[PDB]
């Protein structure tokens, strides 16, 4: 339960390795969480960075209410899904500036993601809190500092 | 929407073993997204086996609204908006049906009704 530097480093290592995630948004009509799969990396300061189709369901939800959840799992893990390490973030979405360096970092890390680069937009998901599940035993509660550096 | 689209949703539903669960953080209202074991019940309705003490199980006790994602971007997947209601072999774990209101099916999207997925 008690957060250690080891727990902090696993959380940071998951974010550095992340190419995709499950994104939680609030359905405007009903306020029920909409859970969709997204391309997700970090930018320079290690803050989660999403690439969304600007008029898709999850992008429209964000436009109306920027409250956002992320699940980040180890994509390479083998065996039972429930023993994979995974990080839950509670955050707020913010449209991310134009940047030549950003649109390039992203391709070096995800080549496939040329198809997307149009109507496609970067969002920073600024963390408030985090839940680390290491694959076994009890989770760690994380602050925003715990996840970033 | 079409029969092959309804058939794809139930296909993903049938022999799904885990999912991303979306519940509402009670303090902040932010969607909390965690991984869960998920099966269908007798009648094809999503069924989650959830630890009573875990953040998500707490969250559903306060407000039973629940999202599910069942499946990286070329993978067929299914988002479900629904409401949770209570229903190896450790005691504190419990069963929930996530009762579908609507759905979003991504093959390559398609809006779906509760009965399109059952």
Residue numbers in the entry:
A (entry chain A): 7 to 123, 126 to 157
B (entry chain C): 9 to 79, 87 to 102, 123 to 143, 147 to 156
What did the published study say regarding this structure?
Within the opp operon is a gene (pden_1323) annotated by the National Center for Biotechnology Information (NCBI) as a pyridoxamine 5′-phosphate (PMP) oxidase-related FMN-binding protein. PMP oxidases belong to the same superfamily as HugZ-like HOs, which motivated investigation of Pden_1323 as a HO. Here, we show that Pden_1323 is an unusual HO that shows specificity for the degradation of c-type heme instead of b-type heme, differentiating it from all previously characterized HOs. Activity assays of Pden_1323 with the hemopeptide substrate microperoxidase-11 (MP-11) show c-type heme degradation to free iron, CO, and a peptide-linked β- and/or δ-biliverdin.
The X-ray crystal structure of Pden_1323 was solved and found to form a dimeric split β-barrel similar to HugZ. However, comparison of the active sites of Pden_1323 and HugZ shows stark differences. While the two residues of HugZ that form salt bridging interactions with the carboxylates of heme, His163 and Arg166, are conserved in the structure of Pden_1323 (His64 and Arg92), the entire N-terminal α/β domain of HugZ is not present in the structure of Pden_1323 (25). Furthermore, the C-terminal loop that contains the coordinating heme ligand is not found in the Pden_1323 structure. Taken together, the lack of the N-terminal domain and C-terminal loop indicates that the presumed active site of Pden_1323 is only partially formed, which provides a rationale for Pden_1323's lack of HO activity with free heme. Given these structural characteristics, combined with the fact that pden_1323 is found within a gene cluster that is likely involved in the transport of both heme and peptides, it was reasoned that the substrate of Pden_1323 may instead be a c-type hemopeptide. The inability of Pden_1323 to cleave full-length cytochrome c shows that the peptide linkage must be small enough so that the porphyrin macrocycle is not buried and is able to access the active site, while the cleavage of hemin at high imidazole concentration indicates that the histidine lower axial ligand (rather than the c-type thioether linkages or the peptide sequence) is the crucial factor enabling catalysis. This suggests that Pden_1323 may bind a range of hemopeptide substrates in a way that creates a HugZ-like active site, with the histidine residue provided by the peptide substrate coordinating and activating the heme iron. The structural comparison of HugZ and Pden_1323 suggests that the change in substrate specificity from free heme b to a c-type hemopeptide involves the loss of the C-terminal loop containing the coordinating heme ligand and an opening of the active site to accommodate the larger substrate via loss of the N-terminal α/β domain. In contrast, HupZ lacks both the N-terminal α/β domain and C-terminal loop and thus more closely resembles Pden_1323 (36).
